[PDB]
Amino acid sequence: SDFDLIVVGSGLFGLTVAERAASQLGKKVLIVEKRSHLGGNAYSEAEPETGIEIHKYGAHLFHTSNKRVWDYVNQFTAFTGYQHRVFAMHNGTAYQFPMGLGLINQFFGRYYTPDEARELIKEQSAEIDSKDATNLEEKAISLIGRPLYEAFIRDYTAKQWQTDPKELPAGNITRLPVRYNFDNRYFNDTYEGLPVDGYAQWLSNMADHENIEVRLDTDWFEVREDLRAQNPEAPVVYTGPLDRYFDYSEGHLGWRTLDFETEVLNTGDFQGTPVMNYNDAEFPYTRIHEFRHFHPEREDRHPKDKTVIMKEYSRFAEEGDEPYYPINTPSDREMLFKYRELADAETESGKVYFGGRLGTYQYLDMHMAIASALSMFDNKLVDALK
Amino acid sequence: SDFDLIVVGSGLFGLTVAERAASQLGKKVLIVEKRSHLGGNAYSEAEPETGIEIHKYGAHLFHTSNKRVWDYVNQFTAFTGYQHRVFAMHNGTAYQFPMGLGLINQFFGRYYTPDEARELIKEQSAEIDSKDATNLEEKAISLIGRPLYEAFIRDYTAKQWQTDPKELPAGNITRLPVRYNFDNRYFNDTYEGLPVDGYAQWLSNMADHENIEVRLDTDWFEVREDLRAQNPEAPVVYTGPLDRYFDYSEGHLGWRTLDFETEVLNTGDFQGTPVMNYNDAEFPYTRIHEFRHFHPEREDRHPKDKTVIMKEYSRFAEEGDEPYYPINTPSDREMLFKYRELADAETESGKVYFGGRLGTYQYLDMHMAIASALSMFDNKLVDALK
Ligand SMILES: Cc1cc2c(cc1C)N(C[C@H](O)[C@H](O)[C@H](O)COP(=O)(O)OP(=O)(O)OC[C@H]1O[C@@H](n3cnc4c(N)ncnc43)[C@H](O)[C@@H]1O)c1[nH]c(=O)[nH]c(=O)c1N2
Ligand SMILES: Cc1cc2c(cc1C)N(C[C@H](O)[C@H](O)[C@H](O)COP(=O)(O)OP(=O)(O)OC[C@H]1O[C@@H](n3cnc4c(N)ncnc43)[C@H](O)[C@@H]1O)c1[nH]c(=O)[nH]c(=O)c1N2
Ligand SMILES: O=C(O)C[C@@H]1Sc2nnc(-c3cccs3)n2N=C1c1ccc(Cl)cc1
Ligand SMILES: O=C(O)C[C@@H]1Sc2nnc(-c3cccs3)n2N=C1c1ccc(Cl)cc1
Numbered sequence A, B: 001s002d003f004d005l006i007v008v009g010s011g012l013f014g015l016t017v018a019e020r021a022a023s024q025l026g027k028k029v030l031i032v033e034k035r036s037h038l039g040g041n042a043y044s045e046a047e048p049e050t051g052i053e054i055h056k057y058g059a060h061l062f063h064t065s066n067k068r069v070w071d072y073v074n075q076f077t078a079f080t081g082y083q084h085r086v087f088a089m090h091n092g093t094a095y096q097f098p099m100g101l102g103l104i105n106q107f108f109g110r111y112y113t114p115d116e117a118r119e120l121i122k123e124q125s126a127e128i129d130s131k132d133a134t135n136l137e138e139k140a141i142s143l144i145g146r147p148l149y150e151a152f153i154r155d156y157t158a159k160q161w162q163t164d165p166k167e168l169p170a171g172n173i174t175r176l177p178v179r180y181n182f183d184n185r186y187f188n189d190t191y192e193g194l195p196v197d198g199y200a201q202w203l204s205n206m207a208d209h210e211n212i213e214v215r216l217d218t219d220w221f222e223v224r225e226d227l228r229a230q231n232p233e234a235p236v237v238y239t240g241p242l243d244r245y246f247d248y249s250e251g252h253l254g255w256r257t258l259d260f261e262t263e264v265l266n267t268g269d270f271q272g273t274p275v276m277n278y279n280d281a282e283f284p285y286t287r288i289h290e291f292r293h294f295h296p297e298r299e300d301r302h303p304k305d306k307t308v309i310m311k312e313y314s315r316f317a318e319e320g321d322e323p324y325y326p327i328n329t330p331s332d333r334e335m336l337f338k339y340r341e342l343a344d345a346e347t348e349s350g351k352v353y354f355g356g357r358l359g360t361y362q363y364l365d366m367h368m369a370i371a372s373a374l375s376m377f378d379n380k381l382v383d384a385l386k
Helices: A012-024 A067-073 A101-108 A114-125 A136-144 A146-161 A198-207 A220-230 A330-350 A366-385 B012-025 B067-074 B101-108 B114-124 B136-144 B146-161 B199-207 B224-230 B330-350 B356-360 B366-384
Strands: A005-008 A029-032 A044-046 A053-055 A062-064 A087-090 A093-096 A191-193 A212-215 A236-238 A255-265 A275-278 A287-290 A307-316 A352-354 B005-008 B029-032 B044-046 B053-055 B062-064 B086-090 B093-096 B191-193 B212-215 B236-238 B255-265 B275-278 B287-290 B307-316 B352-354
Touching: A005 A012, A012 A029, A012 A198, A012 A212, A012 A236, A012 A366, A029 A220, A044 A198, A053 A198, A053 A307, A062 A067, A062 A366, A067 A366, A087 A146, A093 A101, A093 B101, A101 A114, A101 A146, A101 B093, A114 A136, A114 A146, A136 A146, A146 A307, A330 A352, A352 A366, B005 B012, B012 B029, B012 B199, B012 B212, B012 B236, B012 B356, B012 B366, B044 B199, B062 B067, B062 B366, B067 B366, B086 B146, B093 B101, B101 B114, B101 B146, B114 B146, B136 B146, B146 B307, B330 B352, B352 B366, B356 B366
Parallel strands: A005 A029, A005 A236, A029 A212, A087 A275, A236 A352, B005 B029, B005 B236, B029 B212, B086 B275, B236 B352
Antiparallel strands: A044 A053, A062 A191, A087 A093, A255 A307, A275 A287, A287 A307, B044 B053, B062 B191, B086 B093, B255 B307, B275 B287, B287 B307
8 A cells, every 4th residue: 555645736735734744644645736736826937038936826925923834834945024015006096005094195185194094984984884785885885985995996896706896795895994004014914925935946845755745747536546446544635626526516616717918028127016906997907916026135136127027817717717716606605515514424434634725615825724734634634644 | 450441432333342342352341421321322211101112312223234233233132023114294195205106106196107207207307417416406306306306305405404405515415216116115224123122121231241341420531530540551442522522622513413302192193104204394393203113013012092202303413412413514524634633643642442423423323333343343452452
């Protein structure tokens, strides 16, 4: 028998689980990854012409307030001091973003003290009682007022979810916080940074252990009869699609996908910030990423008069698209439930554990996936591998 | 016989000289300090009614790109992650500051790309060519255009120096940088932070050594005859005013001083950011500091319906005002040249060394003082107090 553990999927969840087993329990791990590379969607690589590090599966920003995770993660990479900030384009003006005093002054046309702004938001949002809000539009209005909702929320939402917010259902927003200071640090986590040597290097490291064999370009469902037969004792951590695992017997869970239009441009700086949101309906893309700006420490390496940008587009994920964000319509929810029960059975009866973004039909930040894998390793995999 | 070195003044340049003396080459040192505390103007303390750390003699922000100084400095304290950011109040709008894409957008009314912005600034500063320009005012306009100059530079300059910019020489401004991106990190030094437990602590530990004894509330001139008698080959490091040493014999050197009106308010947040510049003439003060925002990691220990602010005012420094920034008028310089030969003759026949802001008539950042002190300690001191 070849392996004590089988991990399907090479994302942060899979990797963490495989790496812990390998180095903590001394067990032997096979990682079966369907793509040609490790790391799932966190994987990055050099754009050929500029050499700038880019993401083909979406921009990734590491941040966490979990010291265990931070310490763990720092075993495989150093991190830059990068602090993620975002701006929001509305009617040809780049707004300071997360809503706070900066956006408020730009928007309403004059400076508001912290107390004056609290009062402003209340006066604006009073048009509707949260109690009386019958949908998402009303709920949002009830929280931040119609002008801010109409300026920065409505269209942006329609683009991402391709639905009128008048038609989404009110419970979808519990809160829309306004910062009543000038703090525009996008994350409020203790630790934040980008991998000094790029993502690929970091993920590659997590998998570089003597007790780990990586199997790229290999669909689990194509080789699972063999592998199970040869390693009948070995449990399985599955981070693949949950509905696909059960042969879509309860239907197909709905995801949004993302399209990325990449351009190399003959300027050294296109927007002077890593990410520009586009809140208006008049521009089809949701954001533009300019990647050089993610690693300002590399400016000497970087082209002087070239930059790579990437326009992002939201779309329902169809036959052949990469699934990215779970949609969670009522049907999706009822469907998820049936699959969740089936999974419970499978785990008990089969020693097949489900994890990760796809495995659980749930969006996970990198640090939340890592935490969840540390938990599964602790509460389940040490016993199961004992 | 009792001391191998006397250091005058407990500001950073002195603490650096005395510590590098005691710790590294062993000698026993005396520090004489006019004032009732260590640190000079760096010294912080808690404000009674709120307990918030404040500087009674001006906000101090540590930042440097000298690793040696960074290292040295950490030997005595630890630093927060704090990054300094400034906002500029003009005609009732807080502006993103250092001039860059943000300010430009707020000011000119629409978003300019990095390239578009460079065009805009070129076109606006075309009005005066650089090697034209009689005065500083014209030089500025030559570099950034007249509208920006009048909004953000003119009155603010006039407030700090109490002079008409158009009767300052053009030479005073060489570069007037506008950032053609969205970076508003105020300093661009490699290392940056505030002392986790305040400056007061940090300063103590600089002193706190065995070969270091320090007399507070002690004027050098009131006691130097005795001390020089008993300890008569011990060279002196003088960091007091260069002109008061030689009894103002060649004139009084012109300095700026700052006054600080302190207010404790019935509100947890006055302006939502540490420092707001006031660029306009209708405001007597240059700057408002709200000190709770210097240390956000203590928002628990902080009150939640109180905060303390300081309005900063600029004035010509009287004798017995605390000198802050050298004015360098032509009379000032001519005076300075003769104070220098007086001081250099004094070093060479009295073994008194002249260092620090006050001893050299020269503004020094915290880290430029330490760097300076170290290089005196090397080149001048250890050589001649073998
Ligand atoms: C567009 C976009 C943007 C972001 C993010 C995600 C996405 C999609 N994330 C989340 C981040 O990618 C995170 O690492 C994952 O969500 C973690 O969950 P998984 O480990 O399951 O990753 P992930 O979903 O990447 O791993 C799944 C892997 O399993 C493989 N697989 C699927 N089926 C298989 C099969 N049958 N056989 C073999 N292999 C199979 C897949 O190929 C894939 O590599 C993020 N996080 C963050 O912290 N900050 C951020 O800014 C972002 N940004
Ligand atoms: C208002 C203001 C604001 C700032 C700053 C200064 C000032 C004045 N600085 C500069 C910094 O505070 C200062 O340079 C350092 O403390 C060290 O400089 P010196 O020790 O050389 O002068 P420093 O003044 O600190 O040292 C000399 C001290 O010796 C004492 N002394 C004078 N005469 C004496 C006598 N006859 N006998 C005994 N003792 C005597 C005085 O109390 C005097 O302060 C700063 N730096 C930075 O990096 N970031 C910042 O934000 C600021 N902000
Ligand atoms: O920017 C990001 O990386 C994620 C943002 S923010 C966020 N936080 N929680 C969630 C989700 C919960 C449940 C499903 S998605 N999101 N969704 C994002 C998002 C959603 C849909 C689309 Cl088309 C594009 C971005
Ligand atoms: O923020 C600070 O700590 C100082 C600023 S910025 C700066 N950098 N170098 C210098 C000087 C060189 C030479 C004389 S002063 N300055 N001056 C400042 C300043 C000057 C006058 C006034 Cl009333 C107030 C602040």
